[PDB]
């Protein structure tokens, strides 16, 4: 009943930016200071994975 549109999920961009900038510094403790790390989307396989 009514209009239709896809389900979605919102995340505040500032909070996510801060969370990533805080996690990268803890990762640098294991994989080197003054280095670059990346993360793209999933590789492929199961829909639940």
């Amino acid at each position: 009943i009514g209009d239709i549109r896809q389900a979605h999920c919102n995340v505040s961009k500032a909070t996510w930016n801060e969370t990533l900038g805080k996690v990268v510094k803890q990762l640098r403790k294991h994989f080197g200071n003054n280095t670059i790390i990346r993360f793209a989307n999933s590789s492929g396989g199961d829909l639940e994975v």
Epitope: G2, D3, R5, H8
Partner: antibody, heavy 125, light 109 residues
């Protein structure tokens, strides 16, 4: 680009009621409000009422209390105006009006660039 | 209530002549709730200018809109025989919409 399609002309006896349909084509339904602007033969434009389809934010004209009723039908995606206690004054041409422009809010305070072809209501016994 | 009035009831203009229609509001209204419509020969009204200044889609350069607070003006620098008829101003701000009484333009003779 949106569009509005109305019904055909009708002749009703004085004192009875009349029902006019208005269906949009190619656009959002529950967002912007549907207004009704009538024109008596030879006079200026007159605002009948306004109503958001499904939300229910509606309001009629001061002249059209106890005689006007605006409703809708979403299975058909069509709004409906009902006018009771018809006199020779209510004879004229009625226009279904609407504005076009993740937004789930509802607008009622907006102009009308999309106009229906019109419906000719003739009150004559 | 909020009611509108239009001053130059019948405004005569020839080809290339410049005219200015007026639309006075009763109370003080915002400059973002006034629109101008064109109605030629009892046909469908066409939105000329929204928000008293925002020229609509495809509306030519000849139609310029101004106004603030109480008075709103519609200036036509030049005109073809295409744009003749009744011009109406609409207040679309509050919960009650109201139109202008209409203003017809003539070929000046």
């Amino acid at each position: 680009q949106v569009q509005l399609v109305q019904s055909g002309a009708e002749v009703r006896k004085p004192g009875s009621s009349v029902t006019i349909s208005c269906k949009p084509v190619g656009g959002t339904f529950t967002n912007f409000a549907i207004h009704w602007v009538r024109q008596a033969p030879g006079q200026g434009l007159e605002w009948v009422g306004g109503r958001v389809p499904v939300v229910g934010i509606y309001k009629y004209g001061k002249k059209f209390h106890d005689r006007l009723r605006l409703y809708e039908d979403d299975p058909m995606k069509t709004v409906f105006l009902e006018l009771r206690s018809l006199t020779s004054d209510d004879t004229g041409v009625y226009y279904c009006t609407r504005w076009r422009g993740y937004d789930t809010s509802s607008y009622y305070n907006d102009a009308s660039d999309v106009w229906g072809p019109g419906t000719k209501v003739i009150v004559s016994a | 209530e909020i009611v509108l009035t239009q001053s130059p009831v019948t405004l005569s203009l020839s080809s290339g002549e410049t005219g200015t229609l007026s639309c006075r509001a009763s109370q003080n209204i915002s400059s973002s709730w006034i629109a101008w419509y064109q109605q030629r020969r009892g046909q469908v009204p066409r939105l000329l200018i929204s928000a008293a200044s925002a020229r609509a889609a495809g509306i030519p350069d000849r139609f310029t809109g101004r106004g603030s607070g109480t008075d709103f003006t519609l200036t036509i620098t030049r005109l073809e025989p295409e744009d003749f008829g009744v011009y109406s101003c609409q207040y679309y701000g509050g919960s009650f919409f109201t139109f202008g009484p209409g203003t017809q333009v003539d070929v000046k003779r």
